[model samples]
Structure formats: C-alpha cells, structure tokens
Target chain A: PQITLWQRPIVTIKVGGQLKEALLDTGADDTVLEDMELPGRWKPRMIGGIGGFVKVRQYDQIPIEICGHKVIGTVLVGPTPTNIIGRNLMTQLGCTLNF
Target chain B: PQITLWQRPIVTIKVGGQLKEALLDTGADDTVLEDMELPGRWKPRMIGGIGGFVKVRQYDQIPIEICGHKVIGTVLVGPTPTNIIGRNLMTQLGCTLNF
Candidate 1:
C-alpha cells in the first residue's frame, strides 16, 4: 500500500465565538469540538459513519478557515481537551517539517 | 486583588510544521509550549525573573496567532499536553459565560 505521512503542527485555533480556542491536531481522524458545560440542551440525533454508528447527539459544527489555506465544513464539538485534528483534515492540506 | 472567574474550554491545538497536538487550558498561570524531542539543532537561552534570574534553558520562541490575535515571544518549552491559555491571555480577554 502506498501512503504518505503528513504532519501538521499542533496549534490553538480561535473560533469566531467567545473563549473557544480549539486544538488543531493533524493526527486525528475527525475535527472534534469540546463543549464547555452546556445548560439545557439535550437532543440526541442518530448519526453514524461508513464503518458503523459511532455515537448519537453531537454538539455543534463550526465553520473555520485554517492557515489561510482551506475551510473546514463541520467541526465536531466535544468536552475533553484531548480533541484533535484527524486524518480527514490533515490530508486535505499536506504538511511539511522544518528544523 | 479582586479576581474574575473565567473558564476557557479545554481543546487540542495543532501547531505548524510538526506532527504534535497540544491541549488548551485556562486554569494555568503560564503559557507553556511542549517540546517534540528535537535532536542536536536545539539550543538554550538564559531567562530572568522580576525578583531574580530563573533556572534552565529555553528552546525557542514561536510566533502564533489565536482567535485573530497574534503574539510572539519565547515560550517555556516542556513535555506535556497541558499548554494553557492562562491569566496573561484570559484576564485580558474578560470573558463572559454563555449557554
């Protein structure tokens, strides 16, 4: 199998909203967003992937432009800071390494 | 000193030119940058504090812009996922909690 190893630097992404700075992870497979303790918003939606149903009831998707390069369609929202930039976005714009 | 309670969401930050992913924190007092195990080419610099000179060597200062705000200075390089957006950035932000 022929594949390329793309590496994108880890950075803090500031959203258009307030106090929402997300981590940009290139190793991640999905662009997840972490929700900061929402009040009374609970509506589960049936969602899945080509593999299968991953989970239900995700937060909200955020539209963003990265590095003056490309724009992301939907950013998955979450709670943990361990959230990341997955393969989908990483391959969208290949990476480079500098010393 | 009268202090305000500001809560920033924990997030993953993707940097430029690396395959690293760092976390975002607001509860921290200092902004730390994690090292990616550089070999040989990395050097150190001496730093001083207000009261006196501090100990150890710093890697390098990286220029980064978050939320449309750009800033550049030497950051304390370490090995951890807890790269925080502490008092320096949060206090100046004066954030308000929203649902």
Candidate 2:
C-alpha cells in the first residue's frame, strides 16, 4: 500500500525479538532505535542529526523485519527522538520514492 | 523514475528564482528552505524535527518547480540542517512510499 507524508509513513518492525514502531526516514543515513538490550556486543559510535549528536551502540549485521520484509543490516541503539528505518534498511527493503 | 534512499533522493527545485538542491525528506512534515529572501509577506511560525524548533517565515501558495513538475504550496524559510522538500509538497508531487 502507498502512504502519504501527511500519514507520516510510520511502520511496524521487529528487531531483537521485540516489536517496535519506526519512522521511514529517507533523510537519515542509518537505522536508530531507542536504547534496548540485544544479544550481541556492540561498538560505540555517535551520529549527528537535526539537533545534535547521539552516543550509540552500533550492532552490525542484525536481522530486522520491516513490514514482513526480512533484512539484515546495522542497527544503532541510542537515544533518538523516534525509532527510524533509515537508508541502510530502506535499501534492503527496496523502498522507493515513487511519483 | 524510482530513487534509492542510498542515493539520498536529492533533487533540484526552483524557488524564488533560484535553483537549489533539497533532500526529499519524507520524515519532515513541512518544506523548509535555507534562509533566503523571497517576494511577498509571510507569517511567523516555528517547526521541530530531529534537532529542535526553528523560527520560520511561512510563505503560503508559493510557486515552486520540483523535477520539472509545477507545484504551489507553503514553504518555510529558516535555518535548517538542510533544505528539505517535505510532505506538503510531496503530496502535490503525488509522491509515495512504494515497496
């Protein structure tokens, strides 16, 4: 189904065995989630956005399901305004800006 | 044509007699441009995003051309992380998130 920007393009996703809601942020470069526990260890990293930088735990090669589409990629766990499905996962999901 | 998020979906837009590049930001609710002078009076307003609130001059029903498509809508002028073509104009462009 197609969605308008007014609708905000929020989608359900599953990661780390838990269900979560995320925004389809085409402007963002990476996937970021609210701070959560995961199975594997992660390396520390930071990302910049509209307001400021966030200290994050970068977990690479994690399997996440977006709208039932299986994708494996990096997941950034940190303090974010909202959970975001960024370009990394969007690429795997084959998301497109269709006119 | 379909554009990938990895490509950032950057596009050329003509506004205020100037050609500028903007990110096709589905996550953003309103179109915000970098500080520039334009014709007509505007209303004072504010908007928020990943960063913080920005004081803006809201110009309504302004003519803009995106990717050769003519559209007239509200455009916010202010300090921004980047020039963003948000849902307001995207709706006029008939843009959608296609899987």
Query: Where's the lowest-lDDT run of ten residues in candidate 2 chain B?
Result: B46-55
Each candidate's fnat, listed in order, reads 0.00, 0.74
State how far residue B25 of model 1 sits from its true place (Å). 21
Q: Evaluate candidate 2 and give its CAPRI docking class based on DockQ.
A: medium
- Runs in model 1 deviating more than 4 A are A1-8, A16-21, A36-61, A96-99, B1-99
lDDT string, candidate 2, B2-44, tens digits? 7777778899999999999999988878888889887788999
Q: How many clashes in each candidate?
A: 24, 2
C-alpha lDDT values of all predictions: 0.38, 0.85
Runs of candidate 2 exceeding 4 Å displacement:
none
Best by lDDT: 2
Q: Candidate 1 lDDT, tens digit per residue, A1-99?
A: 111112223344445444344444322335555553332344454332212233333334444545555545345544333445444454444432111
TM-score of chain A of 1: 0.47
What CAPRI grade goes to candidate 1? incorrect
